[PDB]
Amino acid sequence: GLAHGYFLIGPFAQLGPLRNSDIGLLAGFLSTIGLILILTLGLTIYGAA
Amino acid sequence: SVFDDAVKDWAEEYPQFAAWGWGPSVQAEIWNGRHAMFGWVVMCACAYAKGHGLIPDADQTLDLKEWGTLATISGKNTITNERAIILIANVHALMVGLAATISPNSFADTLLLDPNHPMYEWQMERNSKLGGVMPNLGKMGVTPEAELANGRMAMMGIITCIAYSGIQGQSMIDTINEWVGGAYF
Amino acid sequence: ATKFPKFSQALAQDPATRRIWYGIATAHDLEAHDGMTEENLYQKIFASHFGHLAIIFLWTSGNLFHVAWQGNFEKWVSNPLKTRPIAHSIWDPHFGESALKAFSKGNTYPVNITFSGLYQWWYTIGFRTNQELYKGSIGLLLLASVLLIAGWLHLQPKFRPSLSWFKNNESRLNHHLSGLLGFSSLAWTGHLVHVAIPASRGVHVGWDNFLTTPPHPAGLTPFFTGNWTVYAENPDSATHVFNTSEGSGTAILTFLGGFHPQTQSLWLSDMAHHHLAIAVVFIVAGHMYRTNFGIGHNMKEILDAHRPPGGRLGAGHVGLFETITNSLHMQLGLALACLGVATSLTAQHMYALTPYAYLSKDFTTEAALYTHHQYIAGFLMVGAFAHGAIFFVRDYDPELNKNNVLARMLEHKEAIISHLSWASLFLGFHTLGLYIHNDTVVAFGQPEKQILFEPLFAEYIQAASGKAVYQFNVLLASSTSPATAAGNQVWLPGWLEAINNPKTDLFLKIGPGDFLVHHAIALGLHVTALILVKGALDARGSKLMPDKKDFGYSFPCDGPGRGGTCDISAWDAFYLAMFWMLNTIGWVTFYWHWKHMTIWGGNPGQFDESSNYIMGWLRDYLWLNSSPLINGYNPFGMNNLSVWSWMFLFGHLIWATGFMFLISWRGYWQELIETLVWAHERTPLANLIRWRDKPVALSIVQARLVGLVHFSVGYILTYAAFVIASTSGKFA
Amino acid sequence: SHTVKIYDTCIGCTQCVRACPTDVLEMVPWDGCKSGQIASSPRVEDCVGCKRCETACPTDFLSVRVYLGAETTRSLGLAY
Amino acid sequence: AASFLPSILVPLVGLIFPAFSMALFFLYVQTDD
Amino acid sequence: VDLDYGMKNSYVPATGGDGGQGQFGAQSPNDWRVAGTSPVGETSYAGAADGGEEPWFAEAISTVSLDLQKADETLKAFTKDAAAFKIEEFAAEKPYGFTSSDAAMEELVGKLGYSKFLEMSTKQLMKTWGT
Amino acid sequence: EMSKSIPFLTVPEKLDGSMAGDVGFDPMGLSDIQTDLNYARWAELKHGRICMLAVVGMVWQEYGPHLPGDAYATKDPWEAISSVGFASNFQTLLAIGVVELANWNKYYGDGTPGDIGWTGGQLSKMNDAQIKTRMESEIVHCRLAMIAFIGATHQTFLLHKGLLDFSY
């Protein structure tokens, strides 16, 4: 997790909808957290099955 | 009416969910109650801030340029700073909750009953002896019993507040201030 | 079973992904589920119907709610011909500021304009305020809940209906004809007389005053006395302004004929009389079958006795009673067929005899409604033939129907199929040939050498009803005709005005160009029918596969032998006919749109002259009217037609994607998937994760279905954008 | 998995059993034909549904009929 | 206020609901009763 | 050898549309739905092969094989009944100085191996056992 | 064979005199399609009991002491609903709902139709015959109330006059 989270904030922060906004980095962080949640759901479901 | 029968029927109709503790169960009663108790604090805090004008630059809308269309309520109209701040506070809390749900400890009360968690047995036992109509005194202090009693109380209060607010045609914040004696405002 | 397809052990024990795909698509074939008894089948179907009804009501409730909460009905009511109706609001977080402004034009918030015609219908039926619409939505939500309760109730042990109840034809028909259709119509005329007509004249009659506001000044006295003529006296003047009392009348039941002068729609009084008459007819007809009261007809006897004495029709209709009662597929086929005809009729008669106020002036809505119902009609028609074939393969008893009218049909199958083939060929060769002749001569610069046949027969029919332009002095077009004398003092006065008014769609003028398109539509119907009919007749067997009945309605093939047996099942006929259905409906819809477009634009001549050859359709219709759509979004900006523009391109994608499934077959893909499996199992890290359902390629029939769906969805979506953006972009 | 049935019209040409790609068919003794042999399908659990057998039958209508049915790893020819 | 509902429900209907539904279907089809 | 090992599987034939367990069973007794790869020093597919220092390619380490000696036994066991029928017929046709079915089998298979024995007509056998 | 109530018609089979109030009245034969008359009996009782209260209430409200406070004074029974307000009405509805859902199994079960346990001390210390007599009294009163309800309501909206106003 430590490895995959660090590199994911980049794509969102520099190319996202609010990249040029002063709150762009903050938005990027939130987006990354969202993606992590989706991936975590997948892991949970996989384990169950 | 016997309560037990209704719960049994629910389990039968929806067995899969019941297995984890979802639905009309002690686990839910405990967790939902804990959240309600905590919320009361949040709602009272919001009232205090509103009355004492603590929230910075309220009654103003976030910029549609700095923020995005996600901040729009209708057309180009945007959310006021106050509501935004209140939401962020709640988000701080929700994040803690998500971590606790996804990454539980070895000595923690998990949201759902998992046979593979070390605390499964204790939780199953606690829930088995925590059911009743009347608060069981003699177990005052920090006990599972006290927690459930206080939780039920808090949840009832939420219902009452909404109803009273409607009957008196007032905001919930106003009713809170009223029940406190008008201290916040 | 213990896996996903609980109703099928065969699929459940499958080790591949097919288990999931097939289980989903075989879910509603309750008849084939493991361990299904006839009683259970009927009971489950009955309950499922309750659910469908609930969905329909929830849908209606939503429209009312959203129009009431986010629409402009009241403003529209005030100025109907200068306001664009709103459907629902838009909250898309992906929109840019520019888009928010474009879609918010004319209003204060982003919104979608409705082309469903609900505003006109509701305005006509009596709705005037948003609060009224709200009440309706709430009521329907409640009714939906009641229906859901019924579904549960009749699946309970003591309320499950018996198989006999499900097969009492007489009682159901009597009840459905007399009560569902007859009494309901009587109730509707009640509403029209009590609420609608008063509203048109400026009076408000609602739940607050309906019991104290008499619909007619005389009262119910004339009705019981027998002096019914009183209810038809004092019809609204020709100077009546709708929704106001200026020039109003008192009549409630009349046979004026024609359209209200101001709203250009049928008179409400006439509609009330219409439903009243229909009511009596149906109520009387519902007293024909025996239902535990002695009197009545027994359907079996009626069918059995009808055998032509000459023997030309064999044993007649003996045996059909049992076949129909014991086959749900035949029943469904008969129903779908009749409903299909009804849907087409609604489309055809609704654009000519406009029923709602100010609907004729809304060009885009009028166009959408026609294309909507015509397409639905096509699907309904194809389904009827499909279930007819399923019947032959599954429920047909050769012995019961011995020398029956049905069996004899399967005896001269070759004759029917062959002759239908000839018809298709004749129509095809000459229609295409004439079009190409006209194209070539025109291209060479000699339009005077075109073969253009006047539609004389149709023109005659129009004249017979009163049209005078064609100069055929016949029937109602003749002042000396006995027919004219009969209705000259009844309904003709109003009709002869509308039929002879160039600004109405009542019997639009026809010319040489219409002749050809009509013959093309004929080709479509005949060829689509050939495919479907052949599929039905050759579903129980053929020379190539004399044992087809033992394999079922849908099977992949019968092997690469005996010459090759691809697409030999009956299901494949449905698959092939779908394409033709879409083509024919497309031709029909194109014709309606272009003709009307030119009329609305004020240049009827363009169609009259350019419709004779194919290039005209491509250049003066598809190319010319696509300019607004393709410019929804350009390198210089965007407008409210952007959504429609995007959808147009989206449709093309889905359509073409469909081609992949249709032209490419399984073998190639299966081999490729195998290589991918190897990779996943041999790539480190990913090896950690593995599947529980072996990855395999889609089946032969599955691919056909998937492809047809992609083709169909793209087809409809692309045209939907064009018909809306083109009409709205130019005339709205 | 799949179902293979042999009918009385068989002539014991052995062509079917010589075409099966998975040894599902055999030639068993019989007296209804001049050849004194009939085909049998002892191991239908290995039928892949190729229908090569049907393509080889010389009878007016196939004496060997393969009706596709439930699918297993073997019938779906999955080496993975 | 009801006006805020579009911005509170759409996120849920188009994102949260579909996700949970798909998850449940997967768990249902991957289970061996 | 358990001749029914394959037949003893979890497969349950359906009513209509299924050939059945056939002659050797329709599916393997074991379930293919096992897990994926595991970290060094761990095992996943039950009696799996330890991947050693390359757990990523453990599935490529074979553990299922055929012993040539054992192969002989399976051949004999699965073809026991056929041999029985063959010898029985040979016995029925008045064998010269016959002894015991089993004895005859051994003598007849001592020569002509076993495979050849299974593929020989009773007539050929009698000719062979004339001595 | 022939109905007691209607002497010129044949009595439906299910009506055998077992249940209270069985005067052999089912001219339209609505009893045959039903497996049993339990659910129907529950409904008859429920409908009747509600009607009993309604008729009494209507008369009282028109000619009786109202509760203290405005909005609780309108004599018109129909206007009362709106006057009293949504809050009051909703609370009653919710209460009724609770009782209805709590006794759900009873309604759809196989117990004595109409018995939810609210028997007070009555219907006790009495023989079966006496019990039936009481039950018959209830059903008779239920039916009377239902007929009365229709009349009262119809008279109110047709004649537009008070229930106890008898003028000709």
Ligand code: CLA
């Ligand atoms: C496939 C091509 C493609 C690409 C490259 C982009 C790119 C982008 N889109 Mg877009 N988009 C596309 C197709 C594409 N779009 C399509 C088809 C649609 C229609 C549905 C859209 C609709 C769309 C919307 C609606 C929006 C965007 C947005 C964005 C931007 C945000 C990027 C982001 O958050 O990604 C996040 C990416 C990741 C989390 C992962 C990136 C992949 C990694 C880098 C791969 C690494 C591989 C690695 C090298 C392997 C070796 C490893 C080894 C060495 C160890 C970005 C410029 C947003 C924007 O602001 O527009 C500018 C936005 O709001 N897109």
Ligand code: CLA
């Ligand atoms: C009242 C109408 C009605 C009823 C009750 C039935 C009932 C039935 N039909 Mg039938 N049918 C109908 C109308 C009807 N049909 C019509 C109008 C047609 C013509 C198209 C057909 C054509 C037809 C065929 C060809 C077949 C049936 C079959 C069946 C049976 C099984 C259905 C099934 O397995 O579906 C299970 C559930 C599904 C298939 C889910 C449907 C998913 C659809 C295909 C895709 C949805 C569209 C797409 C996703 C939209 C997304 C677009 C978006 C991107 C914008 C069932 C008895 C089948 C059968 O064998 O019966 C014996 C069969 O083979 N029907």
Ligand code: CLA
């Ligand atoms: C442009 C595309 C196209 C065209 C032209 C056709 C044409 C035809 N299809 Mg067809 N089809 C198509 C696409 C097309 N299909 C697709 C995409 C599908 C998939 C669903 C099908 C599925 C389908 C089915 C399932 C069936 C047909 C049938 C037919 C025939 C109908 C009878 C007819 O029109 O006779 C006239 C035919 C033509 C005019 C076309 C050929 C014209 C050539 C150029 C000759 C012109 C001669 C000219 C008049 C001058 C002659 C004299 C000269 C020699 C001097 C016809 C040959 C039916 C059939 O077999 O017919 C009975 C049938 O059952 N089609």
Ligand code: CLA
């Ligand atoms: C109704 C459904 C719906 C909704 C509400 C949204 C909403 C959004 N999308 Mg979107 N999207 C959708 C469907 C939807 N999408 C579909 C179907 C597709 C596939 C075609 C896409 C593809 C897409 C792309 C490619 C991109 C978006 C982006 C965005 C964001 C742009 C606005 C903004 O401020 O970005 C700035 C972002 C923020 C201010 C962060 C907001 C906080 C996040 C969203 C929290 C998420 C946590 C969430 C609860 C986790 C889910 C858990 C799971 C169980 C469901 C916005 C949140 C863009 C983006 O930035 O993504 C985030 C972007 O690049 N969308």
Ligand code: CLA
């Ligand atoms: C069908 C039953 C019924 C219904 C729906 C109503 C409805 C109404 N009554 Mg009314 N009423 C009823 C029976 C009913 N009444 C009877 C039987 C009496 C005589 C005791 C009265 C006497 C009465 C008075 C004196 C007044 C009303 C008034 C009203 C209105 C305000 C509510 C209120 O204050 O009630 C008051 C209710 C009571 C005084 C007692 C009600 C008796 C209940 C039905 C006993 C049954 C309880 C049940 C068995 C157990 C609980 C059920 C479950 C929820 C747990 C409202 C429209 C008020 C009004 O005028 O509004 C404008 C008012 O002043 N009612």
Ligand code: CLA
């Ligand atoms: C329990 C039921 C019941 C009762 C007691 C009443 C009672 C009354 N109604 Mg009424 N009504 C009812 C049901 C009832 N109605 C129903 C169901 C409807 C239709 C929805 C109506 C419609 C109605 C209208 C439209 C009118 C009345 C009127 C009247 C009043 C005068 C009736 C009259 O002149 O009869 C006279 C009776 C006769 C001329 C015939 C003689 C009676 C027969 C021959 C035998 C009677 C004996 C029988 C056992 C009755 C005993 C039962 C009773 C004593 C409890 C009276 C207070 C009238 C009025 O002015 O009241 C304000 C009036 O205008 N009612």
Ligand SMILES: CC(=O)O[C@H]1CC(C)(C)C(=C=C/C(C)=C/C=C/C(C)=C/C=C/C=C(C)/C=C\C=C(/C)C(=O)C[C@@]23O[C@]2(C)C[C@@H](O)CC3(C)C)[C@](C)(O)C1
């Ligand atoms: C500020 C202050 O303090 O001053 C007060 C003073 C004062 C005067 C008191 C005021 C007042 C008035 C008040 C508070 C009035 C409250 C009125 C209230 C609460 C009124 C009805 C409940 C109705 C019921 C229960 C009806 C039917 C229940 C029925 C009909 C049933 O049949 C139940 C049913 O079970 C049966 C029996 C059989 C079952 O098989 C079936 C079901 C389950 C359906 C003021 C002025 O407002 C304010």
Ligand SMILES: CC(=O)O[C@H]1CC(C)(C)C(=C=C/C(C)=C/C=C\C(C)=C/C=C\C=C(C)\C=C\C=C(/C)C(=O)C[C@@]23O[C@]2(C)C[C@@H](O)CC3(C)C)[C@](C)(O)C1
């Ligand atoms: C295949 C099919 O559909 O067949 C169906 C058709 C149909 C019609 C449905 C059937 C039926 C039912 C019947 C019996 C139909 C027959 C006739 C029908 C339609 C109805 C009945 C009587 C009407 C009467 C007695 C008139 C009252 C009319 C009276 C008393 C008056 O004239 C009042 C009035 O005089 C005053 C006082 C003064 C005048 O200034 C004004 C007038 C003149 C208006 C059938 C025959 O059973 C089967």
Ligand SMILES: CC1=C(C#C/C(C)=C/C=C/C(C)=C/C=C/C=C(C)/C=C/C=C(C)/C=C/[C@@]23O[C@]2(C)C[C@@H](O)CC3(C)C)C(C)(C)C[C@H](O)C1
């Ligand atoms: C009908 C029937 C029965 C019944 C019943 C009845 C009475 C059912 C009623 C059940 C009832 C009424 C249950 C209330 C729940 C309230 C909850 C969960 C509140 C949660 C509150 C939470 C989680 C708090 C959240 C917040 O803190 C957060 C999240 C953010 C803060 O910013 C703000 C607040 C504080 C808000 C019988 C008779 C019993 C049996 C019969 O068989 C069936």
Ligand SMILES: CC1=C(/C=C/C(C)=C/C=C/C(C)=C/C=C/C=C(C)/C=C/C=C(C)/C=C/C2=C(C)CCCC2(C)C)C(C)(C)CCC1
């Ligand atoms: C497959 C099948 C099926 C189906 C079938 C179908 C689908 C059919 C259709 C059919 C149709 C779809 C038909 C149509 C018809 C039409 C008609 C029959 C018409 C007629 C007309 C007339 C009679 C006349 C009219 C008129 C008048 C009235 C007057 C004058 C003018 C005129 C013209 C208008 C089933 C299921 C049964 C089963 C068996 C097989």
Ligand SMILES: CC1=C(C/C=C(\C)CCC[C@H](C)CCC[C@H](C)CCCC(C)C)C(=O)c2ccccc2C1=O
């Ligand atoms: C592309 C292609 C494929 C391969 C296409 C495939 C495998 C589709 C795979 C993607 C779809 C969208 C399924 C993916 C589903 C997700 C993995 C999520 C599934 C979740 C489950 C719970 C349903 C065929 O199998 C095929 C067969 C016969 C003729 C033509 C073709 C053909 O053209």
Ligand code: SF4
């Ligand atoms: S579907 Fe396959 S096996 Fe059947 S005829 Fe076509 S190519 Fe041959």
Ligand code: SF4
């Ligand atoms: S279908 Fe193929 S595998 Fe099956 S018996 Fe015929 S040749 Fe053999």
Ligand code: SF4
């Ligand atoms: S090919 Fe046909 S006829 Fe010849 S042996 Fe096989 S089944 Fe019999």
